[PDB]
Design a protein around this nucleic acid. Structure first.
Length: 862
DNA sequence: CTATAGTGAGTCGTATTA
DNA sequence: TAATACGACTCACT
């Protein structure tokens, strides 16, 4: 083990060396240096900036010292935060805070004092530990290594790219460990809050706002980025110049994963990562010695893909994102949106100061969103411009408790349009007729043209040749591209395309082209159940046309509407018929006849069913859609000015929720029958079997466990949090008493255990597919560069051909030799129940579909 | 999922510390 | 001595 076995001084030297031999000495330090930014800002690096940081940092740092004197100069008990914070270096505490606070303000929703406070403690603790070794480390790579200039060089602008290291040739000292916080959450939060409290004091960077003072289920306290400060981020250029996200890319290939922890990043002066993100330590220890060569292999392969900033697009982005009217109708506006005017009628409540509260609300709900979207954007731009020149960069990877693979860094290939467009693959190959083809297939997809057959997609592309060429030429003048669904990505396609018209198929392209799965989960359920009626619906089977589940699910809603418009119930009486005299209320019930018509008066298209149905693989049922249709279709309808046909809004949702559910239930009968078998399993596995008046524990509440095809075990165990509050005098102004979930966990939550299985299962299932797909597309075919995004697979135009069939292969290969459901039963059988037994099973029926049809399936990527 | 978390005041009793 | 900070509890809440 790295720990214990070695001494602080060694551990602080090992990473640098094992990283200097490879890649050179110049980068060796750049890698550690860069990583060290997660904890402290560099003296030289800072001073060199003579941006926002240049004012925050110094004032913040001074305030931490002032406080330390204040605390000591006083008799009696010392604030709990002190105890922990006093140990840590003020230059690190300040940076971690500022840095971390901002990153948290990127979330348009969870900016409650607890989320923020928690983040700070989680990182301030990472410096508390590791800080020593981190210091030694800085010292060590700051000094020049001895002799050999050929080894100290390394890089050299050649054509070959840095090669990853051999897991077998890795020093023990690099084998990480202990990647879990060890502080009681109370202490953690304690630290957090004070840091925050000090940020405010020294620099009014943020403010605390009381939200919904009174509501027992909504009340809260949140952090808001102070106005003047927010306006600088949107207005100035690079106000976040020296404020890089917690996790940044890499300048050298990521440390391979050999164990449960300590992979990806290199420095030992940091808090090691963790193969699997988990709710607890022990929970993560269940992977200590599992043995899943394929999982690690898939991961390690994924890390390797080299990326490079897309210089050109970075050039366009740096500009347009500062226009008082950007051509991209999505880039958050610069000028705040002014609140609605008041009808002057203050003393009237017909609906004035009744709904006006709502009117203003929305505007406020948006300003916050738009503000925090600006920060995320700015973070990306900063991160983009920061590595714009780097020949190449890499991304370390992680997994969620289900398996799904994720890029650790904030700015990563799994981001949004702009984020994606700013990136492209490091090395490419000559496009060739094969590539040029799909490069144009992607560009089509990049626009809202992906519901049609390939040939016809191609038409669209060539039919806009002059357009594509115009924009590529002068992007700031021919903004046609910025009017496309995936603007920055399309624009990224134009730069390449034109690049082919200027070099022929001998052109070397690296743009990552992706093939996204139609409707993951519904695909997977369909395969494991061989449902033909449903698989086709998604797209498993070949067709002349691209199937559109959300669309075939809509045509069915319509025919029921048509019929219920002709026939159907008749508007019912009131509540006086059920209870004569006393309740003239609900003077309306509305039958199916009226309700349907109201729907036929609105339209009911593919939109009205998209979300309502795609949340099927999330535990949604007929009751779920109710509150879904309402806010996603009717509410904003009324709220706009239309939808005046929904007289009794609450009832309309009820009618539609039914129709969608009744409609889907027949379309993908399988998925439904499978989700049910799983809900009916987690239930028994959860429930606490008890005897009548004896209460003896026949068998306790257990967790649902199963293993995925590529051999990745997964345990799903939702638990009930043990809460508590804290009494914190805030800025000596009032007592902030936040409710917080304590690390100590108790009884299992059978309700969430049940309603969470299905959605979790498939996701885990498509996670293994994504992995197998990386191993196959890497061994069978040359594909070595991957742009994974859960249900979207991408590579370079050259390798596109092979990846396109690779996904089909693995997809097929697995469900032909694996009965996941049965394999599941082989889990909770010999590991669950003792008495009942019956009234549970009934494995769903298998279908008449041929998993081979997939290979030839034209529009069923993934 | 990407972890997440009702609020402040009025009152007491307690170990701690200049 | 006698300040200090804060966990514990109980309440009322636009």
């Amino acid at each position: 083990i790295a720990k214990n076995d070695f001494s602080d001084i060694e551990l602080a030297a090992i990473p640098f060396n094992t990283l200097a031999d490879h890649y050179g000495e110049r980068l060796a330090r750049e890698q550690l240096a860069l990583e060290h930014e997660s904890y402290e800002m560099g003296e030289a690096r800072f001073r060199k900036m003579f941006p926002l940081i240049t004012t925050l940092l110094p004032k913040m740092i001074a305030r931490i010292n002032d406080w330390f004197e204040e605390v000591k100069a006083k008799r009696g008990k010392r604030p709990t935060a002190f105890q922990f914070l006093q140990e840590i270096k003020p230059e690190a505490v300040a940076y971690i805070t500022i840095k971390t606070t901002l990153a948290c303000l990127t979330s348009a929703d969870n900016t409650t004092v607890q989320a923020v406070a928690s983040a700070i403690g989680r990182a301030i603790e990472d410096e508390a530990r590791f800080g020593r070794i981190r210091d030694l480390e800085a010292k060590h790579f700051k000094k020049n290594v001895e002799e050999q200039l050929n080894k100290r060089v390394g890089h050299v602008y050649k054509k070959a790219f840095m090669q990853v290291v051999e897991a077998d040739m890795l020093s023990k000292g690099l084998l990480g460990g202990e990647a879990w916080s060890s502080w009681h959450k109370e202490d953690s939060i304690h630290v957090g809050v004070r840091c925050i409290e000090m940020l405010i004091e020294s620099t009014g960077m943020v403010s605390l706002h009381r939200q919904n003072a009174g509501v027992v289920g909504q009340d809260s306290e949140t952090i808001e980025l102070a106005p003047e400060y927010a306006e600088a981020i949107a207005t100035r250029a690079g106000a976040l110049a020296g404020i890089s996200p917690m996790f940044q890319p890499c300048v050298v290939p990521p440390k391979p994963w050999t164990g449960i922890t300590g992979g990806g990043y290199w420095a030992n002066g940091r808090r090691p990562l963790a193969l699997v993100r988990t709710h607890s330590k022990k929970a993560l220890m269940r992977y200590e010695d599992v043995y899943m060569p394929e999982v690690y292999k898939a991961i390690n392969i994924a890390q390797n893909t080299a990326w490079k900033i897309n210089k050109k697009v970075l050039a366009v982005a740096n500009v347009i994102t500062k226009w008082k009217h950007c051509p991209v109708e999505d880039i958050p506006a610069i000028e705040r949106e002014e609140l609605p005017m008041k009808p002057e009628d203050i003393d009237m409540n017909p609906e004035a100061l009744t709904a006006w509260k709502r009117a203003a609300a929305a505007v406020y709900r948006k300003d916050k969103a738009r503000k925090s979207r600006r920060i995320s954007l700015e973070f990306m731009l900063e991160q983009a411009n920061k590595f714009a020149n780097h020949k190449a960069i890499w991304f370390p990877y992680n997994m969620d408790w289900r398996g799904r693979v994720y890029a650790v860094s904030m700015f990563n290939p799994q981001g949004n349009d702009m984020t994606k467009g700013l990136l492209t693959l490091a090395k490419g190959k000559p496009i060739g007729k094969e590539g040029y083809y799909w490069l144009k297939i992607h560009g089509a997809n990049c626009a809202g043209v992906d519901k049609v057959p390939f040939p016809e997609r191609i038409k669209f592309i060539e039919e806009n040749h002059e357009n594509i060429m115009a924009c590529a030429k002068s992007p700031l003048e021919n903004t046609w591209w910025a009017e496309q669904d995936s603007p920055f990505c399309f624009l990224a396609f134009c730069f390449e395309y034109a690049g082919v018209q200027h070099h022929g198929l001998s052109y070397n392209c690296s743009l990552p082209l992706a093939f996204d799965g139609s409707c993951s989960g519904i695909q997977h359920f369909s395969a494991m159940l061989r449902d033909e009626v449903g698989g086709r619906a998604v797209n498993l089977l070949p067709s002349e046309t691209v199937q559109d589940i959300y669309g075939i699910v809509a045509k069915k809603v319509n025919e029921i509407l048509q019929a219920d418009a002709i026939n159907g119930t008749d508007n019912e009486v009131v509540t006086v018929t059920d209870e004569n005299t006393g309740e003239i209320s609900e003077k309306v019930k509305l039958g199916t006849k009226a309700l349907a018509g109201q729907w036929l008066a609105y339209g009911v298209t593919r939109s009205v069913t998209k979300r309502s149905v795609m949340t099927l693989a999330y535990g949604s049922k007929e009751f779920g859609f109710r509150q879904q249709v309402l806010e996603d279709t009717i509410q904003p309808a009324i709220d706009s000015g239309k939808g005046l046909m929904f007289t009794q809004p609450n009832q309309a949702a009820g009618y539609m929720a039914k129709l969608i559910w009744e409609s889907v239930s027949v379309t993908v009968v399988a998925a439904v029958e499978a989700m049910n078998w799983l809900k009916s399993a987690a239930k028994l596995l959860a429930a606490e079997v008890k005897d009548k008046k004896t209460g003896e524990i026949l068998r306790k509440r257990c967790a649902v466990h199963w293993v995925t095809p590529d051999g990745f075990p997964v345990w799903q165990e939702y638990k009930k949090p043990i809460q508590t509050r804290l009494n914190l005098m805030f800025l000596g102004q009032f007592r902030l008493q936040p409710t917080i979930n304590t690390n100590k966990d108790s009884e299992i939550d059978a309700h969430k255990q049940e309603s969470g299985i299905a959605p979790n299962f498939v996701h885990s299932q498509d996670g293994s597919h994504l992995r197998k797909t990386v191993v196959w597309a890497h061994e069978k075919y040359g594909i070595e560069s991957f742009a994974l995004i859960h249900d979207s697979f991408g590579t370079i135009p050259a390798d596109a051909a092979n990846l396109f069939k690779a996904v089909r292969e693995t997809m097929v290969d697995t469900y032909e030799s694996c009965d996941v459901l049965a394999d599941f039963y082989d889990q909770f059988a010999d590991q669950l129940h003792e008495s009942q037994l019956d009234k549970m099973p009934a494995l769903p029926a298998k279908g008449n579909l041929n998993l081979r049809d997939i290979l030839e399936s034209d529009f069923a990527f993934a």
